[PDB]
Structure formats: structure tokens, C-alpha cells
Amino acid sequence: RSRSESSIESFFARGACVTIMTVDNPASTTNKDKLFAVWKITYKDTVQLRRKLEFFTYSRFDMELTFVVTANFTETNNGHALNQVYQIMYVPPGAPVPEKWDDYTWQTSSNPSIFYTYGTAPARISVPYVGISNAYSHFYDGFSLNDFGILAVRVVNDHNPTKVTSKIRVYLKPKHIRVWCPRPPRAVAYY
Amino acid sequence: GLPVMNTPGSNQYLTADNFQSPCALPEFDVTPPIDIPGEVKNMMELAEIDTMIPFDLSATKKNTMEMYRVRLSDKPHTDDPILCLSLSPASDPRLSHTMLGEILNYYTHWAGSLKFTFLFCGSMMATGKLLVSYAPPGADPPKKRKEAMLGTHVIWDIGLQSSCTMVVPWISNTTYRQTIDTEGGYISVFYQTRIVVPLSTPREMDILGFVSACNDFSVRLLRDTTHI
Amino acid sequence: GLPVMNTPGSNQYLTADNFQSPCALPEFDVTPPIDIPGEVKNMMELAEIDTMIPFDLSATKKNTMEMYRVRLSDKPHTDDPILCLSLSPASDPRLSHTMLGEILNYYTHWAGSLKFTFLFCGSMMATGKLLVSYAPPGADPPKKRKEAMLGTHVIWDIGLQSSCTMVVPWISNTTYRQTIDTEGGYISVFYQTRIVVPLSTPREMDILGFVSACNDFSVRLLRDTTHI
Amino acid sequence: GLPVMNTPGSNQYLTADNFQSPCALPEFDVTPPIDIPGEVKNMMELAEIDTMIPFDLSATKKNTMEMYRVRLSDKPHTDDPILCLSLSPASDPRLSHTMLGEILNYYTHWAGSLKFTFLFCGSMMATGKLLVSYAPPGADPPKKRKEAMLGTHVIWDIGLQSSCTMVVPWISNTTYRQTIDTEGGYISVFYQTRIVVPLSTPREMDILGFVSACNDFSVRLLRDTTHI
Numbered sequence: 001r002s003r004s005e006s007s008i009e010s011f012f013a014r015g016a017c018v019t020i021m022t023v024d025n026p027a028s029t030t031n032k033d034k035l036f037a038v039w040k041i042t043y044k045d046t047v048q049l050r051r052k053l054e055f056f057t058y059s060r061f062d063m064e065l066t067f068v069v070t071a072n073f074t075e076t077n078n079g080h081a082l083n084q085v086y087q088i089m090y091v092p093p094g095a096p097v098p099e100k101w102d103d104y105t106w107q108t109s110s111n112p113s114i115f116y117t118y119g120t121a122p123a124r125i126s127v128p129y130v131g132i133s134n135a136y137s138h139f140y141d142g143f144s145l146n147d148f149g150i151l152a153v154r155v156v157n158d159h160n161p162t163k164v165t166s167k168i169r170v171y172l173k174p175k176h177i178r179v180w181c182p183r184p185p186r187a188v189a190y191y
Numbered sequence: 192g193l194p195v196m197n198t199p200g201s202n203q204y205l206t207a208d209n210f211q212s213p214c215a216l217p218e219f220d221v222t223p224p225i226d227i228p229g230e231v232k233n234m235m236e237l238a239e240i241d242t243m244i245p246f247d248l249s250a251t252k253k254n255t256m257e258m259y260r261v262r263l264s265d266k267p268h269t270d271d272p273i274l275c276l277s278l279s280p281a282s283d284p285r286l287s288h289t290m291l292g293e294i295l296n297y298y299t300h301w302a303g304s305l306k307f308t309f310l311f312c313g314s315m316m317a318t319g320k321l322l323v324s325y326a327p328p329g330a331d332p333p334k335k336r337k338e339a340m341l342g343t344h345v346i347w348d349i350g351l352q353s354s355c356t357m358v359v360p361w362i363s364n365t366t367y368r369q370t371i372d373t374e375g376g377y378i379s380v381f382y383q384t385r386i387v388v389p390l391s392t393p394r395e396m397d398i399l400g401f402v403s404a405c406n407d408f409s410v411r412l413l414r415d416t417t418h419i
Numbered sequence: 420g421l422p423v424m425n426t427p428g429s430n431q432y433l434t435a436d437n438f439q440s441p442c443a444l445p446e447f448d449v450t451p452p453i454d455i456p457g458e459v460k461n462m463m464e465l466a467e468i469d470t471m472i473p474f475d476l477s478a479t480k481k482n483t484m485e486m487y488r489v490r491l492s493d494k495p496h497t498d499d500p501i502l503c504l505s506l507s508p509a510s511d512p513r514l515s516h517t518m519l520g521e522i523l524n525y526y527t528h529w530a531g532s533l534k535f536t537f538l539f540c541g542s543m544m545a546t547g548k549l550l551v552s553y554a555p556p557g558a559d560p561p562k563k564r565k566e567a568m569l570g571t572h573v574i575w576d577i578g579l580q581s582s583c584t585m586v587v588p589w590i591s592n593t594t595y596r597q598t599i600d601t602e603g604g605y606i607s608v609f610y611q612t613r614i615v616v617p618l619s620t621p622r623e624m625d626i627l628g629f630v631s632a633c634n635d636f637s638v639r640l641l642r643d644t645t646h647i
Numbered sequence: 648g649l650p651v652m653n654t655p656g657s658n659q660y661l662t663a664d665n666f667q668s669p670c671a672l673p674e675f676d677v678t679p680p681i682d683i684p685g686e687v688k689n690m691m692e693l694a695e696i697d698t699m700i701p702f703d704l705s706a707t708k709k710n711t712m713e714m715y716r717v718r719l720s721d722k723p724h725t726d727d728p729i730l731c732l733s734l735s736p737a738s739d740p741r742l743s744h745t746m747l748g749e750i751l752n753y754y755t756h757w758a759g760s761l762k763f764t765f766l767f768c769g770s771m772m773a774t775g776k777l778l779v780s781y782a783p784p785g786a787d788p789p790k791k792r793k794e795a796m797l798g799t800h801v802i803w804d805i806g807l808q809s810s811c812t813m814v815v816p817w818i819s820n821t822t823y824r825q826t827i828d829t830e831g832g833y834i835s836v837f838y839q840t841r842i843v844v845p846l847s848t849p850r851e852m853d854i855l856g857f858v859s860a861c862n863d864f865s866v867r868l869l870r871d872t873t874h875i
Contacts, residue, residue: 001302002676005411006234010674011297014413015206048417052297056231060224064212066204066427090215090435094527094597095642104646112215112435121202122427125215125435130640132528132595134225171206181229182237185293188417192650194420197657198666201425207671210426215435220639222595367678411676420654422666438648 008177011052015066015173018046025084025155025164026101034165035101036154040147041065041172047191049172054186056179058135063148064175065090067116067123071166081164084157088114088123088168093130093147101154115156118166126175135180234294238408241308241401242290246274263313263321263386265394272339272379273321275332276400278305278359281370291402297415300367303408306358307378311349313396318350319386325359328374336381346383349396358405367411462522466636469536469629470518474502491541491549491614493622500567500607501549503560504628506533506587509598519630525643528595531636534586535606539577541624546578547614553587556602564609574611577624586633595639690750694864697764697857698746702730719769719777719842721850728795728835729777731788732856734761734815737826747858753871756823759864762814763834767805769852774806775842781815784830792837802839805852814861823867 004010018041024034041063043049053059069086073079089105090112091097098105105111116123127149129136136146153168231237245258252258261274277283280295287296295301309323324344326332333339347355359378368375386396459465473486480486489502505511508523515524523529537551552572554560561567575583587606596603614624687693701714708714717730733739736751743752751757765779780800782788789795803811815834824831842852 001407001409002411003233003235003409004676005413005674006294006298006409008232008234011234011413013209013674014415047419048415051417052415055237057229058227068204092216092219092527092640092642094599094640096644108643108646110642112433114434115432117430120431121425121429122204123431124212124428125433126212127215128219128221129224130216130219131222132593132597134222134594135227171204173206175209178224179231180227182231184242184290191419192652194654195423195651195657196420197425197653198422198664199658199660200666200668201423201658202427202429204427205669205671207673208426208669209673210428212428213433213436215433216640217435217437218641412672413674423651424669 008179012061012174012177012179015171016046016049017169018043018049018172019170021151021153021168021170023086023153023155023166023168025081025160025162025166026158027161027163028159029161029163031163036098036152037168038097038150038152039170040097040150042148047188049174050191051185051188054138054183056182057139058137058180059177060129060131060135061174061177062126062128064126064173065124065151066171066173067114068169068171069116069118069122069166070169071118071164074163074165077162079162079164081160081162082157083118084155084160084164084166085115085117086123086166086168087152087154087156088116088125089150089152089154090114090125090127091150091152092127093132093149095149097150098152098154106152106154135178139183234297235404235408235410238291238294238404238410239406240290241306241403244276244400244402245285245288246276246400248284260312260397260399261380263311263382263396263398265385265388268382268385270335272332272334272381274400275377275379277332277375277377278328279373279375280305280402282372282375286402289402291404295370295410297413298410299370299412299414301370301408301410302361302363302367304358304361304405305408306356306403306405308354308356308399308401309347309380310354310399310401311396312353312399313349313386314388314392316392317386317388317396318348320346320348320350320383321355322346322381322383323355323357324379324381325357326377326379328362328376330376332377332379336383339379339381349386361407462525463632463636463638466519466522466632466638467634468518469534469631472504472628472630473513473516474504474628476512488540488625488627489608491539491610491624491626493613493616496610496613498563500560500562500609502628503605503607505560505603505605506556507601507603508533508630510600510603514630517630519632523598523638525641526638527598527640527642529598529636529638530589530591530595532586532589532633533636534584534631534633536582536584536627536629537575537608538582538627538629539624540581540627541577541614542616542620544620545614545616545624546576548574548576548578548611549583550574550609550611551583551585552607552609553585554605554607556590556604558604560605560607564611567607567609577614589635690753691860691864691866694747694750694860694866695862696746697762697859700732700856700858701741701744702732702856704740716768716853716855717836719767719838719852719854721841721844724838724841726791728788728790728837730856731833731835733788733831733833734784735829735831736761736858738828738831742858745858747860751826751866753869754866755826755868755870757826757864757866758817758819758823760814760817760861761864762812762859762861764810764812764855764857765803765836766810766855766857767852768809768855769805769842770844770848772848773842773844773852774804776802776804776806776839777811778802778837778839779811779813780835780837781813782833782835784818784832786832788833788835792839795835795837805842817863 021037021039023037024031026035114123243259247258280286280292322344324339324342345355471487475486508514508520550572552567552570573583699715703714736742736748778800780795780798801811
């Protein structure tokens, strides 16, 4: 017998898709807003991760984010296209988040960015702990939840006349974790 | 330059892997962490905390304090166990909902020693003796006090010590117990003698039960299941 | 040759990274640099330069020298502050336009000590005493001279030293102040005594205010916003 | 970064290769193995076990114990061999089905020394002498006892030792015998003298035959064929 498989890491450290960002190629025809998709990194959707985290009160963790992109033509038409390339923007906490497809924010130097060309090795980056305080909290007993930035994705090839929808799974995986003050776990049910 | 050959396995994302990834804020300095008290280093160090066992899961009594006490009474002195309890930390609803169990839920094999406790919490003047017996696995839970006294068992005097503790031992052929369905043993409590009392003091005591892991306990092969 | 595996992250351009790139003029010799005086090594070494605080942002007075002086007068001796001033280096228009503020604008967290200055620039013969008070954050800016004298505050004699300097201290629970909206403290100036003067000398002095960072100041997590 | 060149051979899966592959349970601790007795380290250490040779493959006698004994009798004392046996461990149905042969089946070249055994298993009172002869390859199996006595051959006395053992030697120009079709030698057994016996004891003895590899035996170039 050994404890290894249940150390904090071995427990928390596990790739878990936390969401699927979906965007559409800027088909100048009728594409409304699917032009770009944006998601505020929060565990609060994946019961799985969420639960393991609420087992404690405080924690720090360099979060690593992988990116898996998947496309397909919407029309069975002779859908042709050149290998597209996606932009992956990480927006650190307390930074403006893009609004337009072509909002200045994509260009803005602060935001670390990723250009993943479709059909290649999945993209990957790893923001370090970014709490303004000394550890992300999971509970609070005061007044005016923490941030971990925003992801933003948009296709870059422009006037394509063939709609090309694309999902982008994000596979966040806590690394170098450390927790504080264990708490009883919430029943699977309420989520 | 340096000639190389990409072997199979290149360009596949393998959730279960870890490789130095390029950082997105290389200039950014992280906030140094403080010595917050109560850092946990291993899940076991929660399984090690004696928590309460919901002995009664009767729709009524459950989902309220009532699912944790045992109505030690002074009614017809029957001869069955006061509360039998199978030690399948996972295969039994009673033990399933405990903290120990909660961590066990995230693993397939675990194998250690459970330690139980029975804190009596009746009158200071009340007094009696209860027999707590460990029926080892394979066998059948004892149904008479007699049979149980033949087995291993503490004779815990209410009056002398408000709490009988007792570490059940680790066993398994397959030297890692499987959480799913089917043995594990049992733990029963027998009225040894009635709980005699002085004056109007009520004839309704109660007993609390704890459970936790000992240092020998450990788990392996993680398996989350929580979904919707 | 050497067997290798391209892990995920290959062939992605990551603005936020840096790797030895092949040079396009490997033969080209660069012009050696000279010892130009005034090399800056860190942005802070600009935040460290006391600059003027536009105390008046009244459409009229702004966008001209007038937005920087305070008309110390000798009119009805009211009891409010001469010029209150919230120390939100970023959350306040007055302080926002300063150099300090300009560098702060390119960051999210910064946390140090602001040092202010009030250079009086009225008659050589003029004389009086003004009370400058630091209302710490959470509280409310003082509205009477009395309240302000109870707080921390210098009693700066015009006549003896043409300039009251004073480093306000660093504080914050969240040990990095956020530039956006909401506390920070205040700094007020009270007429302590009227500014008495000899002959026809005008009853219209003025005072200039400076602000800058001290060695303890620093910033982190860059964030440019400038656009169009 | 480091400049590299992918040479030909990259991104091809080559069954016949082995390279460190990323593990899918890097946290998972494996169950430590025990000292189970009877660990085999090399296939040869099975070829080294003398097993029985089905001397008779007659549809009738086969697929039952009967395919392993030789009816040493006391009928008309003919002059042919009692049982001739070609030593093509693979090219001969009789020897093919043996364990030795089973391992040989998984290889193309093998080259060592076969050792045979003939355990007589008739009356304790029975007695006689049989001549066992090794006709070396290239030649022809001997058909008369005389010819066989001229060759190499043991004169094994039933009565003195219940078992004649005898290691046939290794030979081959092509210093690795090919399992497929065509030489290898032979082994015959001649009645040297009739098997004389005392009282009603039956005139029907039997003899068992073994075969196995000696330390010099080895195989090379694996070749599985088993299909459907």
C-alpha cells in the first residue's frame, strides 16, 4: 500500500473539458454573431471539477489550457476552403473583453494570443496563478468569487463564401495545486 | 539541422499527459502565497477524520439530525442487535454517505483499516453494558448476543466510559477491496444488560457512531463518476 | 534520426512567447550604441517624478495653465477644505491625468506609497498656516478644520517653508490596489489661519501640488487599452 | 528553436519498433508483483522438458492414450525395427505434436541436440535386450538388426535398467536446421532378443518414448502461423 494516487495533485490534476466554444467562419452572407465566441474561465459549470474544488476553502493553481478544434461545412454543397486558422485570445483578469468581431481588443498587445491553424497539434498555453489575493477562494463570508480571465476565439480567414462552423473544446487541467481548510462535500444533486 | 524522426504518438492530445507548456504571462509576477493554516496534502487526511454514520435511513428520520442517533431504550428486552452495520464502506447506503465514503467514492480500490467509535450520550447517572461485536467477513452477522460474545467483541460499560472506540482490521484476498458489489464483515451492538437508571431520568438514551481511516488506509486508481 | 514526439502546442504562434528566431542579416554588423545620457531601465523611474496635479478640471480652467493652481484667497473665511483630493491614482480624473497615473494606466495592480507636495507660490512677505490632512480610506473626507486636526495632518506654515511635502502611506487588504472602481483615502487642505499680508501685496496667492511614487511603489500585470 | 530535419521514416508506425510511449495512468500505482514460483524466462525452458512422442498416429489409436505406447510383443520374431522414428522435429507428424515441436513451430531455424528416452513399462520379472540405433542423416534408416548394430546403437537390457536414455547429436551444414521440407536422421529400436518372461505374466509389454532439447538447443527468427 501507498498514498501516492491520492495526493492533492494526483487527485486534482486531470484534464477535463470545461466547455465548448463555438464560432462560425465570417461568412459575409448572413453570419450574425457566431463570428467570435467568448467564455469567462470559471469552473462553475463542470460539476466534476467544481465539486473536487469545493472540497476545500482555498487553493492556488497554475491552470494549463489545451485547445481541440473541430470544423465541418454546414452546407453539403461543394464546400471548399483553405485550412483556416483560429485566433485564441487569453484575456487576463480585469482586462476588457472583445465585443465586435473586429473589436480593437483582438489587436491589443496585453492579451496573450494563439494562432492555431486547423488540423495540427492542439494549441496550448498555461496562465500561472492570477489571484489578486493569496489564493483563489471558493467561499466568501463578506460583500462588495474570483476571475481567471476570458478566452476569446474568432476565425481569421475573412470573406469565405462557405459557412464553416467550428467547436473548440477547452481542456483546462489544474497544475501545481495546493489547497486549504477541507470542507464536507456537497451532494451530487445540487448543481 | 539535427536529424529527427517523429514516432507514432506525435500530435495527439493525451489528456493523461503533462509536458512543459509555453506560459501566457511570462513577464507577469505571481502573487506570492501565504502560510494559510490548514493545508491538506493528501486526500487520505480527510478520510482520517471520524465523521457521523447515518444509522437510520428511514425516509422519515433521514435528511435531519434524526438519521444519526440510536434510540437505546428500555422496552421489551429483545435479543437481536441494537444496530447491526455492514462494513462495506461503499456497498452500504449507511456507510456510503460518510466523509470516508465520499473520498472512497473517488477511487476503485482502497484497502486499510476502518476505526469506529460509539459515543454514548445519555444520562450522566445512567449505566449499563453493551456488547459490540466484529463479525469478520465471509461469515454471517450474529443474531443473538450469545453468538456475538463468542466472536470478537468489546463489553463496553456505559457507566465507566462514555465511548467505546475500536479499529476493525484490514483483510482481503484480493489485497485491495473493490468498492462495488460481496463481503466486508459487520459490527453489531447488543444490549448486554438493560440500561438501568436512577429517578425520573428518561429511559431514552442515544448513541452516536463514528468512522474513519487509520494510517494503513490508502486508495488507488482514481475514478470520478459525478454527472447529471 | 533521433526519435521525437511533437506534443500539443507545436506550430501555434503564441504572441506571448519568445524563442530564438533565425536572423535576416547574419552577416550585417550592427552600429555599436553610445552612452546616450538618460537611459531609463524601468517604467517606475518616471512614476518617481513629481508632476503637477490638475486640481481644477472645470471646462473653463482646464486645458490651460489654470487647471493647476489653487486660488488661495482672503474672501469670507469658510470652513470647508481649500482643496480636497481623493487618492484614487486612477479612479479620479484629477489624479488620472498625471504622469504617475499615465504609467498606472498601463497596469492593473499597483501598490506603493504616493508622496505629495504643495509648493506655495505667493508673496515672499505673505504668511499664514494651512492644515493638510490625510483622511485614510474607508472613512469620509473631513469637512471641518477641527475634524481634520483630529486626524493626521501637517500644520504647514506658509511663512517658514514655501512647501509642505508629505508621503501618504501604502495600504490595502487586497495587497495590490485595483485601478478601477471603491476606496483610497483623501488629502485636504484647510485654511488654518487667514493668509495675512503687509501692504498692497495682492490677497491672491496660489499653491501648486505634486505627486509621485516612492521606492516601494510597483506595478504588475500589464494592460494597454489605448485604441480609437 | 533547435533546428531539426525529419528524415524519411518519420510518422510511420512500424510494428517491429519500440519507443518510450506516453503512459495513460501516470499517477496510478501498479500492484507490486509477488514471487509466484515457476517463472519461465526463456521458451527453451519448456523445450527442455521431456514429453511423450505419439509413436502411433493410426486414426484409431490416435486421440487417446493408445497413441503413445509400443506393443512390445512375443509374436513371430520379425527382423524389422520395433519402431523407426525420423528426427525431423518438425517435418514428421509423430514428432511434430510434441512440446518440443510446439515451440519449434514458432521458429524457422533451430539447432541443437535432441535427447530421447525409452522408459520400458512391462513386468518387473520380464527381461530381454533391445537394440536402439542412431542412423545419422543422409543415410537410410536400417532395416535389419545387423545393419543397425554396425551403426551407433545402445544394447539396452530391459532386465537391468527400465529405461534407455540417449542424446542424439547436433549436425547440419547449414548450421541452423530448417523446420520445413529433407534430412535429419532416424532412431530405431530392434528386438535384439525376444522378451522372455516367467509364468502367466502376459507377453505384452509396452515402452514409452520421450524427447527434449539439451542446453545446446536454441531457436532463431520467430514465425507464428496459427490462424483459422
